[PDB]
Amino acid sequence: NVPHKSSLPEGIRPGTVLRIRGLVPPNASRFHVNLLCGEEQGSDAALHFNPRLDTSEVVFNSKEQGSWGREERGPGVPFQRGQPFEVLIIASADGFKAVVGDAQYHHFRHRLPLARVRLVEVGGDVQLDSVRIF
Amino acid sequence: PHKSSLPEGIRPGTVLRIRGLVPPNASRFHVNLLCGEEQGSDAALHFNPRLDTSEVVFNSKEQGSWGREERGPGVPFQRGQPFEVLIIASADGFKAVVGDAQYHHFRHRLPLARVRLVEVGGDVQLDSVRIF
């Protein structure tokens, strides 16, 4: 459950799929899914997928050398309070594909080498059903 | 049979999501990744769940003849029960995920860049196909 952590000793490669299923609680403000390069605190973040329900946005970003990059925003917020959700983050050679429900939501080009991802974190105001990595 | 055209092919990172239901008296159904709409085209992947024989056969077909058949551990499908399958295209092969666990890993026999068409047919019935 939250905070959910999924170690990836041998990293990921094009063709890796991250399936997160869960619920957005009634008064959820925002939750986040991070593809990090290490388990230590303040580690670099290859991907930062932050759905924000209170502001009705979905922010994509990356952390490198302790400082964040520029935020990208997807088309709307495909999450709603009190409704379950299924998210797929698919790793390709070019970037990360965020798929919500039965629609492609956003494509995040790689800012850091995909070979450096070593951990998946999921936190915030969310009640997870399952976190699986195929 | 359901056909979904892929003019620009597929590459590592392509995910094929099939949601559907196995009819009560289902015999067997199949999902094929073909290289063209011409009939008898080569099949980069042939994913054939067989309910009558309680098996799941993976295979390919090049130049009109099949390869050696691969079989997964058991039959994760049933008559009258819904199913969700994910066919994930990587650099080394196809990863078949049935339900909530990786079922089989089918290594590449034909170039992944030749795939041009997904087909789904046989005694199964369907509720959604998606390609991401």
Question: What does this protein look like?
Answer:
The structure is a homodimer. Chain A has no helices and 12 strands. Chain A is mainly β and 134 residues long. In chain A, the strands form 2 sheets. In chain A, strands 1, 3, 4, 5, 6, 7 and 11 form a 7-stranded antiparallel beta sheet that branches. In chain A, strands 10-9-8-2-12 form a 5-stranded antiparallel beta sheet, with no helix packed on it. Chain A has a single domain, classed as Jelly Rolls (Sandwich). Helix content of chain A is 0%, strand content 53%. Chains A and B meet through strand 8 of A and strand 8 of B.
Based on the model shown, name its key terms.
homodimer, 134 residues, mainly beta, Jelly Rolls, 7-stranded antiparallel sheet, 5-stranded antiparallel sheet, 0% helix
Short description:
The structure is a homodimer. With about 130 residues, chain A is mainly beta. The first copy, chain A, is built from no helices and twelve strands.
Give the SSE layout.
The structure is a homodimer.
Chain A: E1 4-7, E2 17-23, E3 31-36, E4 45-52, E5 57-64, E6 67-68, E7 72-73, E8 84-91, E9 95-100, E10 103-109, E11 119-124, E12 127-133
Binding site for a beta-D-galactoside (chain A): 68-74
Protein name (chain A): Galectin-7
Pfam families (chain A): Gal-bind_lectin
